[PDB]
Amino acid sequence: GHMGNAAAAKKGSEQESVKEFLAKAKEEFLKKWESPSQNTAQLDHFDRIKTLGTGSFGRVMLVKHKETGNHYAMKILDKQKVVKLKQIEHTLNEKRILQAVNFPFLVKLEFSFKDNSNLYMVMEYVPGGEMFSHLRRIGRFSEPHARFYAAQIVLTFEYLHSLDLIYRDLKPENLLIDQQGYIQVTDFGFAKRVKGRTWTLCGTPEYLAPEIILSKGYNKAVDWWALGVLIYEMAAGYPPFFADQPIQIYEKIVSGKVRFPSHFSSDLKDLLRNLLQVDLTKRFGNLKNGVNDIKNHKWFATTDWIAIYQRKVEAPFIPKFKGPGDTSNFDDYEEEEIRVSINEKCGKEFTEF
């Protein structure tokens, strides 16, 4: 067979240790999920420094905690806008998830509070910028570089899916690079705790599985399709299905013909055909062996999964950081004042925040 006695026993033991870990992780998640935290700071505790970008909803600002000098990334959501856009449930759910999860590649929520006009989520500042920026700057990542990032996403989805969470918005724009070169997943605006099948048309067009586009329901395997898209984009420099407008992108995905650059390795092409697989009876991540079909694939043969988790692998790219609050790894955005009305808005709708 493919493994002798020693290697087979080792792999079996490693897989049982993952199960033990995930059982403890679910216990801890559920305690926080059922009893969230709230109201752990206020706006005038922070200096507003610079806009870093926009999330799924609202903008993200670099801020500095006045009493400690620590820097954070603060997401600001306009309650009236959120109501108008039918995003009340999404914003409450995002904060609920963030305060309940705990994993080394998920951004951590440090404070949250609200006022008359806005909701605020104060998260760790990840100063190395978006993977999107670095990818567009150097064109494409060599396969070991892509693999290092991909392994972190595999472990992160393994964790999230054990909690019945589907992420639904994987893309380089949503992946920040920390000072050690590791990835942080930042935005949970479209994530959902789902027992099994769900139907919502949501996510980012290029990353949507065919079953999201089509009327049929779908499950957590859409995230494994999205991983395929991310690995392809990292290694090629462009995603597998593209066009000028969403409806045209959807047609390409459903038509489903994937072609690969000639520099892709055979191992990479095999992995991607098994992730970008329209047939759910065949898609990796969705079979009897679960995530192990991905982790044990030849393309990941050199990946030490525990060493990635323990952040002991040397990263392929270390961002340049010039002191606290340096924003040199971020684009510039239009700066809009943070207005706080004399009158409370939408109070009843956001009680739980």
Partner: peptide, 18 residues
């Protein structure tokens, strides 16, 4: 080339969710 086609008509900047 596929890359030329991406620059010509793919979305090359940041992509919003739907």
């Amino acid at each position: 080339t596929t890359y030329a086609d991406f620059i010509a008509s793919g979305r090359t900047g940041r992509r919003n969710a739907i």
